[PDB]
Amino acid sequence: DYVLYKDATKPVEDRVADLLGRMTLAEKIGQMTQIERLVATPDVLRDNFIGSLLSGGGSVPRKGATAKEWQDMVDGFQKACMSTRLGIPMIYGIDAVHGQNNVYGATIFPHNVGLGATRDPYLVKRIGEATALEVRATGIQYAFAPCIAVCRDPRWGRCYESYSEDRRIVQSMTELIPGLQGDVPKDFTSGMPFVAGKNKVAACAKHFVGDGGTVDGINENNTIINREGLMNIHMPAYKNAMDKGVSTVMISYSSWNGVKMHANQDLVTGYLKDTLKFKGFVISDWEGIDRITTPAGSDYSYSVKASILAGLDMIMVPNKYQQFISILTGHVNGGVIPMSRIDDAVTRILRVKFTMGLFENPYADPAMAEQLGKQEHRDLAREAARKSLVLLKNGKTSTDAPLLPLPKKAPKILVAGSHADNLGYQCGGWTIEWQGDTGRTTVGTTILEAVKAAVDPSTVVVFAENPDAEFVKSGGFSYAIVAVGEHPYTETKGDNLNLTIPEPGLSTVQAVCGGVRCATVLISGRPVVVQPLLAASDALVAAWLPGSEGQGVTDALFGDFGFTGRLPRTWFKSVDQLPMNVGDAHYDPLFRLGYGLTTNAT
Ligand SMILES: *[C@@H]1O[C@H](CO)[C@@H](O[C@@H]2O[C@H](CO)[C@@H](O[C@@H]3O[C@H](CO[C@H]4O[C@H](CO)[C@@H](O)[C@H](O)[C@@H]4O[C@@H]4O[C@H](CO)[C@@H](O)[C@H](O)[C@H]4NC(C)=O)[C@@H](O)[C@H](O)[C@@H]3O)[C@H](O)[C@H]2NC(C)=O)[C@H](O)[C@H]1NC(C)=O
Ligand SMILES: *[C@@H]1O[C@H](CO)[C@@H](O[C@@H]2O[C@H](CO)[C@@H](O[C@@H]3O[C@H](CO)[C@@H](O)[C@H](O)[C@@H]3O[C@@H]3OC[C@@H](O)[C@H](O)[C@H]3O)[C@H](O)[C@H]2NC(C)=O)[C@H](O[C@H]2O[C@@H](C)[C@@H](O)[C@@H](O)[C@@H]2O)[C@H]1NC(C)=O
Ligand SMILES: *[C@@H]1O[C@H](CO)[C@@H](O[C@@H]2O[C@H](CO)[C@@H](O[C@@H]3O[C@H](CO)[C@@H](O)[C@H](O)[C@@H]3O)[C@H](O)[C@H]2NC(C)=O)[C@H](O)[C@H]1NC(C)=O
Ligand SMILES: OC[C@H]1O[C@@H](O)[C@H](O)[C@@H](O)[C@@H]1O
């Protein structure tokens, strides 16, 4: 007879109910299961009725794989899922958090902290739009973004993934969501999931909740704050996300007042679902349920029970799916987890899938492959990089001529520093590899290349990575641009109690600036100890992690555009002050939140 869920003309809720009522326990638990591509095969996906796959950081079909190779991979997985009895398509997720950043040749946008510095939510919306196109170029339908953490301590390894320490700025930047997913209708009910169709992706507000509030910025640790503070600082942007139809929410590894987020029924069910009326699906973080216990994974039966009862809908296993499915099945067979809970999880997952058009367009569009790294998107990334720059100093004394903007025509100029010609360093973490990487890891323009592309043909450009003082003094240079900073890092690898840049960095700046007037470009995911760099430099720019389009840096250095970026975080005098945020009592910043010198074009 007629099969309602297969009818594209029927209301989403009708299709959801019709499908749900046909499903066996195994088919239902399969929907709740997300697995890594590294453990997926056609048989595994078919036999276990798997609902979702992901690429973790750096999980790629091949180094340098083309957009078509990605499409072929995703379609091969999809063909297996479509061959099941019910033919429920899988959704494929990826960390596309500053462009489609795992993918070779993808446009790499500035990281979130720099986007916060722009104070330009419409720019961020356009970045979401471009990112959706480059993710669909690879056949992928779901991005784990935006991170709406409010980082309250820059010692956190994920501080660069937060737009600001000020929740008001984070709230404004939730415009990424309708960029990625499309604008919601006039009639829209807050909390409903939304994706416009095959040229957009499902988004993910992460990580719920208070991930940016942990003690000493220790990643995955304890957020100690009363309910009022949780609701005033860490929660507000989630409500904006509901208003804009975010399709999914990912749960944080962190704890609130000692209670693991992955086990918190009061917040996940009581608040997110029952109070905010979220109707999309809730997803775990990677082995998030394992990490409920100490040691992690020491009581997986408990992990499954606690997380599913808390209200999570889809589990990013991501590897041991056999164990996950077996344990959840036993819990349901034994009455420990009621069918109502399973039915709720599956309802939400299917709602998102039907809503986004996944049943109508389960396969990749080969015509989208050319969106990957499209020059228009690079032009946008270049605009964003330029807008993100914060000018901290532009002259050593009030009577000095301003160094910036620099003249494009000069007999000879020096470009120096570990970060001047290093594409991986200027991109930072979550770029090609999970942790990011060093060197020419993808398609882009380094600071050095951008300088050579900007200057007059008569201008001789010299590169020296770490020149000594004599080299500089003897070189006959008009000025120098010197770029130094943090190395790429991600998650716990980024946790840092000292926030001092690696050497050589300061020594290079001192040697260069001692010999010629210098503009120092600081590449970092966060404020770092900066007084010694300031003391040496004529001008200093906080460029954050500007991404693949290094011409954004030179656009401002050479005065094509004026500097406009303003600090989205407090710049501390010392790490012993931390945590120290705008609005605190005894706030004693080196540079307050909102600080930024300006220049004018030309
Ligand atoms: C303040 O606190 C931070 C964070 O705890 C410390 O940084 C970390 O230091 C530890 C060592 O004490 C380091 O762990 C070792 O890493 C070795 C490899 O390190 C290099 O590669 C990784 C990426 O694989 C980079 O993240 C590192 O920064 C290193 O990179 C090299 O650095 C040198 C010096 O600038 C440079 O010349 C090279 O070009 C560069 N190479 C690359 C590939 O970029 C391991 O072999 C070893 O077994 C340890 O695990 C850890 O990586 C550091 N973290 C980060 C994010 O840099 C600071 O030391 C500390 N500072 C002070 C003032 O105490
Ligand atoms: C020399 O540089 C000056 C400093 O950058 C610049 O003056 C600024 O101009 C911008 C507009 O281009 C002003 O920003 C606006 O501020 C309003 C609130 O006061 C907002 O309602 C606007 O939306 C806008 O805000 C910006 O929106 C985008 C976001 O990303 C930015 O962070 C945000 O600031 C800014 O306030 C001016 N700064 C001050 C304090 O003067 C000069 O150009 C402008 O001069 C101003 C005063 C104005 O008359 C403009 O018409 C003019 O373009 C610039 N001089 C020249 C000749 O270009
Ligand atoms: C927040 O971070 C702190 C610091 O890492 C965590 O405390 C640490 O917890 C681990 C266990 O997960 C402890 O390691 C264990 O120590 C015991 C005792 O010697 C040892 O027998 C085990 O083999 C294991 O290595 C560690 O000692 C402990 N450190 C400190 C300084 O207390 C804490 O659990 C985190 N909290 C949250 C909520 O995530
Ligand atoms: O890679 C998938 C997930 O992995 C986790 O470890 C990170 O915390 C998340 O931000 C990410 O979305």
Author numbering: 1 to 602
Task: Quote the authors verbatim.
HvExoI releases a single Glc from non-reducing termini of oligo- and polymeric β-d-glucosides to support seed germination and plant development. HvExoI folds in an (α/β)8 barrel (domain 1) and an (α/β)6 sandwich (domain 2) that at their interface cradle a 13 Å-deep pocket- or crater-shaped active site. We discover that through chemical signalling, the incoming substrate evokes the formation of an autonomous and transient lateral cavity that serves as a conduit for the Glc product displacement from the active site.
To test the hypothetical Glc displacement route by using dGlc derivatives, crystals were perfused with saturating concentrations of 3dGlc and 4dGlc. The structures of both complexes showed that dGlc derivatives could not displace Glc from the −1 subsite, but that Glc consolidated to the −1 subsite. Others may argue that although most enzymes have evolved to use conformational adjustments to favour tight binding of correct substrates and product release, some enzymes may have not acquired this asset. This assumption was confirmed by perfusing dGlc derivatives that akin of reaction products could not remove Glc, but substrate analogues and mimics could.
